[PDB]
Write a protein that binds this ligand. Structure first.
Ligand SMILES: CC(C)(COP(=O)(O)O)[C@@H](O)C(=O)OP(=O)(O)OC[C@H]1O[C@@H](n2cnc3c(N)ncnc32)[C@H](O)[C@@H]1O
Ligand SMILES: CC(C)(COP(=O)(O)O)[C@@H](O)C(=O)OP(=O)(O)OC[C@H]1O[C@@H](n2cnc3c(N)ncnc32)[C@H](O)[C@@H]1O
Lengths: 249, 247
């Protein structure tokens, strides 16, 4: 139960000691944990719904890109790579609190899982019209669909104003990033990525019309509302049944 | 928001000194989120919990206030004031215990009170069910305590103390945590606000007879209080869905 929360908590700490994860990242991880408590630390129906749309969107994309930050590098290095391949997307390292050493360390971390994998962002020349804020001209710069997980709200908003269709993974359904993205997956990235990889496989042979069917029916606003409603119902349920001295929830 | 950054730095600095555990930085972030969820203030259920905690401490025969790396960075002065106001002993008790951390914590406290007695330097007693360094307490502190305050604590340790028959009070912004659920009295408020309020409550209740104190404790239901905290959060989530930008 709490085993994994402790497991990933140590992974996050390891990432900082290795030079990949920022201190702000440890703070961020903690905030995510609070919200993971609200949704019961699992994938809820509204999240699976959002992931179906996300995968469909990527499979329909012309220049898809998956972004990687210090937290992603520490939590799902292999899965982020598998997702990129499953979605035929490019991987770009893009840090909010960027330093070249963090970028190099992250790239090295990813290489350990796939020495031949192509990694963008090591030398970003273009800049998102929003000091920092540089992106690879062959990656996010040209991308039509971008996946930017555990992202700072402002950054998420910038990319959108930039004409990009933004997909994010964020446990905080009330965050600016969650509200601003086009498709918001409110689930722990450690759970969301392996589910998306599997969804991608299952949808591999879908025609364009059935992929468009899934995307067209998706409403991000309605989905975020369902997330909050799920949380409110669960809270009401817990309050009414009581949680004092309760072993597990 | 200004004070949010202020306390974040205190924690980060505490981490760089080797006083606050690294996990404490993560725990601080979890606290920030829940503080946001309840309103960044002392809600009525928290005040209700504090009144009962204070009354219970004034009834205690061997009260002890536990101190960890996060307390040391956030409320070093207020925890000493609280121990005095409640006539309780102070004991450093860490989950990620190391002698260097204990010494560093003790030193921080000494900056505010050079003569303050500090237990937990040489713990010789084991908490049943708790292994190694994470499970030893001071023979004259928590080991003999009837009422103990273990703020921002890991649930397993809170529970182990309860299993021992001790009356456990905790300050924890996460009402859903195992610690919050297992404690006898759970204060869901930020510790930077809770301690100064408990200091004030203690002075206001110092002349209370044991009957008045027992009245307060007797009317306190931690289960209903935890439920109210959850309903409060639920209601805030709702309003919050209107307050602030959207899309
Ligand atoms: C995370 C961080 C520090 C990484 O910086 P860098 O590595 O420099 O790019 C940076 O992107 C940042 O400042 O993010 P924020 O803290 O603004 O927002 C991160 C969002 O991710 C959420 N979150 C944290 N961990 C997870 C998680 N494990 N899974 C899903 N969501 C998560 C967190 O609640 C918050 O809503
Ligand atoms: C905090 C920590 C790492 C300290 O370790 P050590 O110093 O080694 O004893 C250890 O006790 C721990 O792991 O605690 P947990 O993370 O299990 O639980 C701490 C609780 O405190 C909560 N919290 C964080 N900051 C505050 C705070 N500022 N005020 C009230 N509650 C807070 C946090 O949300 C969490 O529910």
């Amino acid at each position: 139960p709490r085993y994994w929360s402790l497991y990933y908590r140590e992974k996050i700490i390891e990432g900082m000691e290795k030079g990949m994860t920022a201190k702000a990242g440890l703070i961020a991880h903690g905030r995510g944990e609070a919200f993971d408590y609200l949704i019961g630390e699992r994938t809820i129906e509204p999240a699976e719904r959002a992931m179906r749309a996300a995968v469909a969107k990527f499979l329909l994309a012309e220049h898809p890109v998956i972004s990687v930050n210090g937290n992603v590098a520490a939590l799902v290095p292999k899965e982020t790579i598998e997702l990129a391949k499953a979605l035929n997307a490019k991987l770009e390292i893009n840090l909010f609190y960027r330093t070249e050493e963090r970028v190099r360390t992250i790239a090295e971390e990813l290489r350990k899982y796939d020495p031949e994998i192509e990694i963008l962002g090591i030398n970003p020349t273009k800049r998102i019209p929003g000091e920092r804020g540089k992106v690879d001209e062959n990656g996010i710069w040209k991308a039509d669909v971008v996946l930017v997980p555990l992202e700072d709200g402002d950054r998420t908003e910038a990319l959108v104003r930039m004409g990009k269709f933004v997909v994010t993974v964020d446990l905080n359904p009330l965050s600016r990033s969650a509200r601003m993205a086009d498709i918001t997956i409110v689930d722990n990235i450690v759970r969301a990525y392996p589910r998306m990889v599997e969804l991608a496989r299952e949808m591999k042979d879908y025609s364009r019309e059935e992929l468009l069917k899934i995307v067209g029916e998706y409403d991000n606003g309605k989905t975020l509302s369902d997330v909050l409603l799920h949380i409110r119902d669960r809270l009401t349920r817990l309050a009414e049944e009581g949680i004092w001295r309760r072993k597990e929830l």
